Design a protein around this ligand. Structure first.
Ligand SMILES: *[C@](O)(Cc1ccc(C(=N)N)cc1)C(=O)O
Lengths: 28, 10, 251
């Protein structure tokens, strides 16, 4: 979708939630 | 233990 | 969610709560995929063995929530359903194969800081992300233990498990329309979905475009967080042809 998956309170403001790094770190 | 929701939605 | 933690506000703006009118209670989780469509598990609506067969009038969709039981005035939006569509080949007789359903809202909800749709995956994203070892995230207001319920939305990050391991953990016939996730008993960490979480999203964040995609739907499991057992999820991409078909044919 056009604006899908970009959270107003996080991605759109360049703010990370507290555990998302855990996900990204598993994508080896 | 659900709080009463507005009657308008029922 | 067993062994998860409280979600941050606005963390899963696509999380939806399936709410029963009478008696007023939580039925299942769901997800917002557009301003008018909601995705959930078919078993949340139809399960003949337990005489469950909910229609449009039996339910309410609650969007933008954080608290499980509180009416979040000025924050959440409640919507009525126009039409429910269950996958014609949903297999409730044997293994819940093709456990998916779409719900068309009566009128579009307006997006906000707390309400925003998740993306459905494309072939390439599914191909690159749906790999054993990669972690996804599940959210919901379901039980905290197999055995109460949380005050607010819970979240847990779980790794996708190798198909053979999924297969060897159950007597149930696993299909290509399902995938399983969770930690192996020797990994130290744990966690899983539980009753009430069904129908909710299993999402992953793409490292290519930074968007969140819904790879699965909480479908079934044997108990909750049992060692040597894993959570089973509907493979959303495999059933995408059906999703697309229903949307452009019905609105
Ligand atoms: C769901 O919560 C069904 C359900 C789904 C998954 C698990 C699991 N251990 N991963 C348990 C129960 C419902 O129908 O309420």
């Amino acid at each position: 979708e056009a604006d899908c998956g970009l959270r107003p309170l996080f991605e759109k403001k360049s703010l990370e939630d507290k555990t998302e790094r855990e996900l990204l770190e598993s994508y080896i | 233990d659900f709080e009463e929701i507005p009657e308008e939605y029922l | 969610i067993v062994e998860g933690s409280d979600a941050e506000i606005g963390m899963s703006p696509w999380q939806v709560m399936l709410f029963r009118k009478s008696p007023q209670e939580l039925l299942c989780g769901a997800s917002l995929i557009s301003d008018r469509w909601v995705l959930t598990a078919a078993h949340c609506l139809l399960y003949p063995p337990w005489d469950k067969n909910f229609t449009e009038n039996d339910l309410l969709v609650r969007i933008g929530k954080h608290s499980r039981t509180r009416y979040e005035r000025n924050i959440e939006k409640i919507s009525m359903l126009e039409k429910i569509y269950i996958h014609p080949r949903y297999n409730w007789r044997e293994n819940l194969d093709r456990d998916i359903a779409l719900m068309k809202l009566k009128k579009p909800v307006a997006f906000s800081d707390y309400i925003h749709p998740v993306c459905l995956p494309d072939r390439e994203t599914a191909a690159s992300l749906l790999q054993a070892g990669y972690k996804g995230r599940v959210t919901g207001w379901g039980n905290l233990k197999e055995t109460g319920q949380p005050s607010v939305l819970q979240v847990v990050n779980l790794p996708i498990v190798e198909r053979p391991v999924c297969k060897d953990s159950t007597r149930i016939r696993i299909t290509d329309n399902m995938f399983c996730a969770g930690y192996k008993p020797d990994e130290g960490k744990r966690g899983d979905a539980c009753e009430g979480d069904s129908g909710g999203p299993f999402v992953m964040k793409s490292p290519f475009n930074n968007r969140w995609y819904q790879m699965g739907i909480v479908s079934w499991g044997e108990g909750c967080d049992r060692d040597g057992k894993y959570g089973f999820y509907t493979h959303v991409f495999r059933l995408k042809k059906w999703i697309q078909k229903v949307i452009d044919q019905f609105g």
